[PDB]
UniProtKB/Swiss-Prot annotation:
Dioxygenase that repairs alkylated DNA and RNA containing 3-methylcytosine or 1-methyladenine by oxidative demethylation. Has highest activity towards 3-methylcytosine. Has lower activity towards alkylated DNA containing ethenoadenine, and no detectable activity towards 1-methylguanine or 3-methylthymine. Accepts double-stranded and single-stranded substrates. Requires molecular oxygen, alpha-ketoglutarate and iron. Provides extensive resistance to alkylating agents such as MMS and DMS (SN2 agents), but not to MMNG and MNU (SN1 agents). 2-oxoglutarate binds at residues 108-110, 192-198. Coiled coil: none annotated. Belongs to the alkB family. Pfam families: 2OG-FeII_Oxy_2. GO terms for cellular component: cytoplasm; cytosol. Residues 101-201 form the Fe2OG dioxygenase domain. It is an enzyme of class 1 (oxidoreductase). Changing residue 57 to A: Abolishes activity towards single-stranded DNA containing 1-methyladenine. The lineage of its organism: Bacteria, Pseudomonadati, Pseudomonadota, Gammaproteobacteria, Enterobacterales. Its EC number is 1.14.11.33. SUPFAM superfamilies: Clavaminate synthase-like. This is Alpha-ketoglutarate-dependent dioxygenase AlkB.
Amino acid sequence: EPLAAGAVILRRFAFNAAEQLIRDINDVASQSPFRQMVTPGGYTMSVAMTNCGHLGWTTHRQGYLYSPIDPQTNKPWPAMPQSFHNLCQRAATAAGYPDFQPDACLINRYAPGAKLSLHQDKDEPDLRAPIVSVSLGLPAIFQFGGLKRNDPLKRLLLEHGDVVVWGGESRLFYHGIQPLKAGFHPLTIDCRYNLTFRQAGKK
Ligand SMILES: O=C(O)CCC(=O)C(=O)O
Ligand SMILES: [Mn+2]
């Protein structure tokens, strides 16, 4: 589906790769654990996060940043799993962005009730690169708007395996996730995971 200029939803695109992706999420988290962070605004996130790849995103009360080192372990974030690399390249190509080279993958874990408030991904220096966003596990309602905070929002259920890509005209569009409804999924048990691939450094 034609989500917006430069944006698409590839439904169930990652469904066959999901089992492998979740195993790799568990491997990454065994090294750099999921943690709920606090924003510079003083807001404690309900979504727990970790990262893999060259750069990882983290935040605390004094600011946020993309760094090659996990501040909790003082060790590099785990390397990008091959399954992650392969799926991201396939999805980016299917979405019309074949030259996307991510150097960062943020892994979000949503327990029941967790949400991610409406925001823009504007922390990356090079906005020419798209965002590739993978849904795994329990279903969630994704909000996708426009360039301005008050632009009308589309509300779309994202299910296990769905992939959403945005860029170009829609690169800075506002988006978010509504509180996750509780339930059971065989592969993730009681949660929704998301993989957010980005080019966060200079290229
Ligand atoms: O979980 C999602 O589908 C969205 C994640 C997201 O927007 C982000 O991490 O910036
Ligand atoms: Mn985002």
